[PDB]
Amino acid sequence: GMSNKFLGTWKLVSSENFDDYMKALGVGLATRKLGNLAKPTVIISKKGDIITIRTESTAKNTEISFKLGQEFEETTADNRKTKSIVTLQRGSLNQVQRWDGKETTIKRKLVNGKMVAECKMKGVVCTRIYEKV
Ligand SMILES: CCCCCCCCCCCCCCCC(=O)O
Ligand SMILES: [Cl-]
């Protein structure tokens, strides 16, 4: 299952192309501003076979818990109600969210000790880099 090196508290240090990604998701302007300003903390933890990803920012927190490979209901930070599945592919922790026949992926991998998240909607790609605190 998931590498223990994912477990811990992660802080955003770099974001690329997040605004166009949020536009692809249908996010409104007020919320995009929040998203472009935020420098969230992402906390990855595991208990039994359940992984939890908790995101904290000044303006919004989110939290998901899941078993690898098992679909679950999710309410995203921009208030989409999705059905989501997290898988593991060659060390990459990959989240797919589906709603209304739409799909977006968030792939989280470790690179030189940093967590790199690739976000993709309709071919629009962003890259968000985190340092482990
Ligand atoms: C805490 C996020 C900031 C708040 C902005 C809310 C509107 C956009 C959120 C939708 C997708 C977020 C994907 C995050 C990927 C990551 O963990 O880097
Ligand atoms: Cl913040």
Numbering used by the authors: -1 to 131
Task: Reproduce text from the manuscript describing this model.
P2 is a myelin-specific protein of the fatty acid binding protein (FABP) superfamily, which is able to stack lipid bilayers together, and it is a target for mutations in the human inherited neuropathy Charcot-Marie-Tooth disease. P2 belongs to the fatty acid binding protein (FABP) family, and the structure of P2 is typical for FABPs: the body of P2 is a barrel formed of 10 antiparallel β strands, and the loops that connect the β strands cover the open ends of the barrel. Inside the barrel, there is a large ligand binding pocket, typical for FABPs. Phe57 is in a central position in the portal region, and it is believed to regulate ligand entry into the internal cavity in FABPs.
P2-F57A was crystallized in three different crystal forms under similar conditions, and the crystal structure was solved from all of them. Once the C-H...π interaction gets eliminated in P2-F57A, both helix α2 and the β3-β4 loop alter their positions: helix α2 turns inwards towards the palmitate bound in the cavity, and the β3-β4 loop bends outwards, slightly opening the portal region. In different crystal forms of P2-F57A, helix α2 and loop β3-β4 are in slightly different conformations. The bound fatty acid adopts a more elongated conformation in F57A-P2 than in wild-type P2, correlating with the conformation of the β3-β4 loop. In the structures of the F57A mutant, this pocket is usually occupied by an anionic group in the crystal.
